[PDB]
Structure 1
């Protein structure tokens, strides 16, 4: 029967399997038949032989090939993958590499084994897709993932059939991308992956001098250096950057160089081939900032060349872009001065606009009002979804109050009340006094108060909205008490008397505190208690912030925002001015590239 056959292979007793080769001659049955294979998955006898091992050795493994040889299925009984869905595509070659049977890996290929079998099952997917382990579906990539170069010595050189290193998968990933996917930032896993990464590329050049293994991209056009920024892996990132190969046949793809050494001073040399893509699709540094959501991006920006590459373009695009921001604010001020001092001021707004010399100041309302509108809407969107490099975060709140008073001013001369002139010149006084934050210069050293002023801007804007929706809501509440006719002009009188009580003017029109004294007090006392706790919610949110994580995070986002803003400046320039201040030089090395010069000082190495 079949059930006795699938058991004794796991028992590992060839004397209990004797006489079965003449037994298949009578009943004309192949070993790859339906009843000689598991109906659920497709697990065969050889696959069962490699799962259960007697110290890694089962003598039925040459015997199952012996019985399959007389039936004529040497390229079938070995090359039968799994028929199921969850473990789909896994063959016996994948299992023997998995359990490190180096003696039995050699037996499969010599009898005929498909090297390019793909284990494309749901289990062999990455963790975002639902699987538990990913290796790029290739046995050559699987041997690199088992920390076993010995199969890698056997697969690449072979008298029967070699293993193509350049082969991709269904995800378009080569052997190097699987090493990035299995990379972890532990002590052990950062060790051997750097050993395999050096081993494969030199072997790729020695077998194929025309192309490099790093040149082959993915379905998303990602190099192995481009992939390590996505998953946020540090150890494989710092090895590709510090790549200096002492094999002279594979010299022309090394990343780190040695220019000159005048004793204590070393002159290293890093290439900017993918770090600053001038006229290419996408860069390393762009995905470090715009796309990577890994926590390790603060450490990954602290690698050697990028700490100096970001200081290159900061020294060229920092003071230039800052000085334009000072002037472009002064342009918006002088426009608004010409609006205010040239009004005819009769008392009845608005005005006839047919006059050409009055049509000119009509254009000033297009410039001034819309700038306040864009700053008003984007910050509310940024709240739902503090660049203190140039100007500190106290300006963003003060320029917001400038932005609020402009759009209030635009309403008042469209309603018909001529008292708009007070608020209009009021914001003019703030705007010239908002220029006093321009005198600091430029800041690069991060303080701890920078993260504090985001929450200061966050909750005070919440404090204003919880104020104004309460004042409108309580005023709209009291109109609903008026059951007899009441008048629609009463709501303007409720909201007018309600604002004055919070300040303390005491010049009211309807609400008489002498009418109901015992109720007006206990609403006003509780109004103090509501406002006094919301003030303490500011201080507890600050005191609960400046203790534990502010010692690390204020030296993380400040490094992150310094890198974030300088790339936003880089996107602002066109492609013509991009090549003007490009960092790095052409240094002709070997049998010329746009690399970057880095100095060193060392006293120990001689």
Structure 2
């Protein structure tokens, strides 16, 4: 149904300015409840996702005349701050309609600037840009969260060089010395907006945001992340890396010198080595518990779904899994079992492997490790199916071809054919067996199909994939550093506010009211002509 589709709505929709003017002059109302099921969101089905307000239609259709006309109605003035069923205003509508293209970006940027300045001039006391929708998002936060990179890029650095309008600007150029220009960015609600800052929503997205990788490349955010890196996060991160390395060393030493008797636990003696060993064990288990609770805290503060859990946040999953293995080892240690060694070694191997987590923060090593992670996930799921089909087929063929009253098992034959991958195949591992010619034909066919053709194809395809991820690796590394910075500043372990940029600097000194304004401006020096 098309509930609320009044004549004014249709006149605007059809781009008939004459009808719009006549209906408005005749007293047609603006606050139309265009709440029909057609006019709701979910554009996948037939519908109109940016309705529920004729101002939203007037702005979204790129017609300046209509929106400029509704500023001063003859009968009933329009209100820009009018909210639809989900709290969205005209600005939220302008954000939502974007598709991240150059022409659409131009149109949406133009309309956004014009509508915002007109609303400010009509109502200087009302800060339209700060109004939140039902989800608690400003249009800036909505653009950042939803994936509208173009509008975000505009908003973060818009400026107006006019009197009584510059106080609405984000970017300023207050000082210049010949070719040198000292730009300022207010950057409110980027470091913190008390609920959801721009960095928080970009970094901790659900992984469905198409541009979560590209948003952090913009002018102010990249410099902010670099500044926070250089300020205090670099030291804390390297310190954590050092502590983790010491933890792994202690764990390895504890594991290597474990006792060799049966049926734990094992009691301390009057010697000295046992005290070092049990100290190492206690420190290891303490580390395991710490990572256990870190994993839980990560989960609870995010609650991602299956479609987001196993496609993102691999490092937290791996550290948590390490913790699980160590705790199972503890349980078995006290449960009078030998099998604690198995879980302990799996934990140890995973801990040393997870040492690669810290390559983030180092440029070249981090890019390298990201490429490895992506070329594991993309390649094993494609390769191992093909390889295992070949291996299993020829293993069953050979093992069922040979039999006597030693290689009568599918396990051993699977192993002997696996060896051909690592350059230790024999080509003769049985003798006097029936159908020698068939056996040789099968092995040679296996070797040609797998060793000579398949592995070389793996190398070639990995080459292609490498060629196609030079840039995605850089973006992902920057994102990983962003996650590290945000987590470190969010916790910080001291309950201190070190995330501030420059203090309450007197950026503007003017508002519509006769007052000054301090806006936490961050300075950037550039040189140009």
Answering whether residue 208 of structure 2 is matched by residue 288 of structure 1, we say no
How far off its partner does 1:520 sit? 5.9
- Residues 100-151 of structure 1: CA deviation (Å, up to 9, x unaligned): 4434333323433222112222333345452454334212222222222222
Q: How far apart in 1 are the matches of 2:434 and 2:382?
A: 32
Cα distance in 1 for partners of 2:61, 2:312 equals 48
Residues 160-208 of structure 1: CA deviation (Å, up to 9, x unaligned): 2111111101121101111112224344333343333233233323332
Paired with 1:349 and 1:175, the residues of 2 have a C-alpha distance of 74
Indicate the residue corresponding to 1:543 in structure 2. 463
Q: Residue 583 and residue 356 in structure 1: after superposition, are their counterparts in 2 closer, same or farther (change >3 A)?
A: farther
In the other structure, the counterpart of 1:586 is 504
* Equivalent residue number for residue 495 of structure 2: 576
Cα–Cα, structure 1 residues 478 and 383, in superposed 2: closer, same or farther, change >3 Å?
farther
The superposition leaves residues 82-117 of structure 1 with CA deviations (integer Å, 9 ceiling, x where unpaired) of: xxx1x2210001122233443433332343322211
- Answering whether residue 150 of structure 2 is matched by residue 235 of structure 1, we say yes
State the 1:336 CA deviation: 3.2
Q: Which residue of structure 2 aligns with residue 125 of structure 1?
A: 40
2:486 aligned partner: 567
Equivalent of 1:353, from 230, 242, 266? 266
Shift of 1:360: 7.4
| CA distance in structure 2 between the partners assigned to 1:367 and 1:540 by the alignment | 46
* CA pair 274-516 structure 1, distance change in 2 beyond 3 A: same
Deviation sequence 1:253-300 (CA, Å, 0-9, x none): 32112232222211111012111117x111112222222634344443
- Structure 1 residues 527, 556: closer, same or farther in 2, change over 3 A? same
Which of 190, 196, 215 is the aligned partner of 1:275? 190
Question: Is contact 1:452-1:542 (8 Å) kept?
Answer: no
Change (3 A) 1:156 1:501: closer
Q: 1:596 aligns with which of 519, 522, 525?
A: 522
Pair 516,310 (structure 1): closer, same or farther in 2 beyond 3 Å: same
Partners of 2:136 and 2:210 in 1: CA distance: 24
1:326-373: per-residue Cα shift (whole Å, max 9, x none)?
A: 232222313432453473x4xx42345343775874575576589599
Query: Structure 2 unaligned runs (5+)?
Result: 299-306, 510-515
Distance 1:153 1:386, change over 3 A: closer
Specify the alignment match of 1:46 in structure 2. none
How does 1:415-426 map onto structure 2 within 5 Å? none
Kept in 2: contact 1:275–1:283 (CA 8 A):
yes
Which segment drifts farther, 352-361 or 328-337?
352-361
SS of 1:249's equivalent in the other structure is coil
SS at match of 1:329: helix
The alignment status of 1:94 with 2:9, answered yes or no, reads yes
Q: For structure 1, which segment, 218-227 or 127-136, has the greater mean C-alpha deviation from structure 2 after superposition?
A: 127-136
1:318 aligns with 2:234: yes
Cα distance in 2 for partners of 1:459, 1:187 equals 35
For residues 99 and 122 of structure 1, the distance between their equivalents in structure 2, rounded to whole angstroms, comes to 20
Equivalent-residue separation in structure 1 for 2:354 and 2:211 (angstroms): 38
Is the Cα–Cα contact under 8 Å of residues 248 and 351 in structure 2 kept in the other structure?
no
Q: Are residues 1:553 and 2:450 paired?
A: no
- What SS does the corresponding residue of 1:266 show, helix, strand or coil? strand
Within 1, Cα distance between the matches of 2:490 and 2:222? 20
* Residue matched to 1:332: 248
Identify the structure with bigger relative contact order (alpha carbons < 8 Å, sequence gap 6+).
2
Aligned to 1:451: 371
Aligned match of 1:76? none
Tell me by how many angstroms 1:534 deviates: 5.0
CA distance in 1, matches of 2:116, 2:173: 21
Query: CA–CA distance in 1 between the matches of 2:352 and 2:72?
Result: 76
Equivalent position to 2:49, from 134, 139, 143: 134
CA shift digits 1:452-480 (9 cap, x unpaired): 5532476569989987xx89x979x989x
Indicate conservation of the 8 Å contact 2:399/2:409, yes or no. no
Give the deviation of 1:517 after TM superposition. Answer: 7.0
110 and 415 in structure 1: CA distance in 2 versus 1, 3 angstrom threshold: closer
Contact 1:126–1:134 (Cα < 8 Å) also in 2: yes
TM-aligned CA distance change 1:492 to 1:384, over 3 Å: farther
- 1:321 Cα offset (Å): 0.5
* CA positional deviation for 1:505: 10
CA contact (8 A) 2:11 2:20 kept: yes
Q: 2 CA distance for matches of 1:134 and 1:382?
A: 25
Change (3 A) 1:330 1:528: farther
Change (3 A) 1:414 1:225: same
**Contact preservation (8 Å) 1:234, 1:300:** yes
CA contact (8 A) 1:241 1:255 kept: yes
The one of 226, 230, 233 equivalent to 2:141 is 226
Question: How far apart, CA to CA, are the structure 2 residues paired with 1:188 and 1:544?
Answer: 33
Give, in angstroms, the shift of residue 542 of structure 1. Answer: 0.5
Equivalent-residue separation in structure 1 for 2:197 and 2:357 (angstroms): 35
Q: Structure 1 pair 432/324, CA: closer, same or farther in 2 (3 Å)? A: same
Return closer, same or farther for 1:154/1:458 CA change in 2, 3 Å cut-off.
Answer: closer
Equivalent residues in 2 for 1:106-117, closer than 5 Å: 106-117=21-32
Counterpart position of 1:54: none
Q: Does the 8 Å CA contact 1:180/1:233 hold for their aligned counterparts?
A: yes
Aligned position for 1:158: 73
Does the 8 Å contact 1:386/1:454 carry over to 2? no
Structure with the greater alpha carbon radius of gyration: 1
1: distance between equivalents of 2:227 and 2:498? Answer: 13
Q: Deviations over 1:29-74 (max 9, x none)?
A: xxxxxxxxxxxxxxxxxxxxxxxxxxxxxxxxxxxxxxxxxxxxxx
